[PDB]
């Protein structure tokens, strides 16, 4: 890995020893970090250890047998320990709510950031894609875990310039139980997965690509920009899903994005999950070879974009 990463990975492990049983009365609410369409999240202080975490709260109505399995299966996250994966402090059920406790990322999700930034630069997106590719790999090799839903609000980022994956599918029950609860308006579901076929990291890669393009232009790219709004530089959910399956994929705009980057996404967004590139290939693409070579000040760009200092 790296010297500075091994500092950060052990610094967490040691901050995690000061954490024991997570009791709900062991917590002080600081601020709300926002809701989602499954849970709501709080920045919180763990009274015993003194740490500061994020506490995702999922209020579900499921039979206890299932709940007890979801909790069992979330304890698998004590074993995810990559610099590309958000840290995990514990998970428990109390008072009708599953709590998942994780490290605070003070930058927020890339979605929060994309709204603060309009569109995101390619030099940046480059260093993001490197991170996601690395996180998706770390989940497939060492855990045989498919993320199941790569999207900008599931990538987190912090003022030390780290880019990390979160909200990934480590308990199938929990994904399932949350989705009947609140159907959204958008969809990162690859077209095979919408038709019942599942393809290991191939269906995640598609989500990534889509997310790349959304961040790159500043708008969710289905359907594509209506010719005129492109030069500026509502849809029914059943129809987005019909479009994803029965229409060509989205593409970057010409000329304003590098040839290497328009290609990287287009290989990501192939509707056939087998022609679509895999992790081995993306990792050694032109656009990644270069963007890895580019030295970019990520933390400064982030803190500038949020309205903070350095």
């Amino acid at each position: 890995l790296d010297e500075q990463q091994r500092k950060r990975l052990e610094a967490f492990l040691t901050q995690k020893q000061k954490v024991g049983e997570l009791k709900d009365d062991d917590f002080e609410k600081i601020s709300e970090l926002g809701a989602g369409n499954g849970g709501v999240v709080f920045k919180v202080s763990h009274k015993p250890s003194g740490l500061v975490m994020a506490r995702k709260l999922i209020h579900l109505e499921i039979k206890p047998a299932i709940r007890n399995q979801i909790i069992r299966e979330l304890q698998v996250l004590h074993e995810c320990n990559s610099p590309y994966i958000v840290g995990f402090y514990g998970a428990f059920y109390s008072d009708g709510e599953i709590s998942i406790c994780m490290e605070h990322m003070d930058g927020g999700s890339l979605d929060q950031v994309l709204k603060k930034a309009g569109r995101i630069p390619e030099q940046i997106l480059g260093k993001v894609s490197i991170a996601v590719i690395k996180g998706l790999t770390y989940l497939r090799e060492k855990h045989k875990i498919m993320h199941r839903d790569v999207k900008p609000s599931n990538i987190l980022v912090n003022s030390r310039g780290e880019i990390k994956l979160c909200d990934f599918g480590v308990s199938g029950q929990l994904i399932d139980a949350m989705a009947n609860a609140f159907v959204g308006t958008r969809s990162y579901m690859s077209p095979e997965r919408l038709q019942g076929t599942h393809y290991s990291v191939q269906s995640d890669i598609w989500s990534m690509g889509l997310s790349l393009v959304e961040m790159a232009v500043g708008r969710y790219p289905i359907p594509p920009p209506d010719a005129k709004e492109l030069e500026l530089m509502p849809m029914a959910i059943f129809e987005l899903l019909d479009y994803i399956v029965n229409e060509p994929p989205p593409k970057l705009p010409s000329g304003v994005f590098s040839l290497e980057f328009q290609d990287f996404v287009n290989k990501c967004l192939i509707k056939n999950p087998a022609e679509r590139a895999d992790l081995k290939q993306l990792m050694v693409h032109a656009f990644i070879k270069r963007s890895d070579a580019e030295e970019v000040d990520f933390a400064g760009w982030l803190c500038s974009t949020i309205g903070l200092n350095q």
Partner: protein, 274 residues
Amino acid sequence: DWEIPDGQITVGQRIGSGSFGTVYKGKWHGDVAVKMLNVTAPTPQQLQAFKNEVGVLRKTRHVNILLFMGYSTKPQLAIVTQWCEGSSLYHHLHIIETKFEMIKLIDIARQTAQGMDYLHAKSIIHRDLKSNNIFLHEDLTVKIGDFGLATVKSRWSGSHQFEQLSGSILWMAPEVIRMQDKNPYSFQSDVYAFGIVLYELMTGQLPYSNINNRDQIIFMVGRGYLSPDLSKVRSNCPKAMKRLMAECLKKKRDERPLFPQILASIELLARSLP
């Protein structure tokens, strides 16, 4: 004017968020259910259409229908309905796993067509029939709540409201999924819902139990490619019953029966029952 004064409701414990509100247990001449609507955009055209809709719902009285006790605009837009003592069908079937007797299952379905018929008789489309909206008052009687309210199950931008899929989809007829029709909500979109409810009763499961993908379900049901696996009907469910369920579940909405005939089938099935 069916409004209640501001400081009339003693809003209490927060209970849960649904497809179009957050419900707090209330106090108002006895316990109530206060649902704080997600539409907190009280448009001029809206507030007069929701006022009109509360007019119709206020005068709907039936033993299998949840009492619509009126509404509130101060603080924000709210709704007061009878508080149900006792758990919802969904909690019974899928959380507590109440071991109902075969005859009682039928009678839950009978009492439900019973009520749903009254709705359609008073020309009310439910739009959102699911087992979460059927409570078992003192475990005996069936009470159907969360009916109507089309004007606040969508959000508004002027005098036009975009109808959004919200909440859970398992009960949505395929024409409601697609949203491609004029008004896709119909007496058969309600009947189709009822069909899924029957599936819950006859199988003890929600449909599409083997698909942990939501969007997959949406696409496939809308496109006609997916419908409930009916072999999962428990072994001792009346042959006459299974068939009734499949009529409601007909993909093309116009093959589905209406509640007048549905309720009839059940009572026939009830009577002739060892």
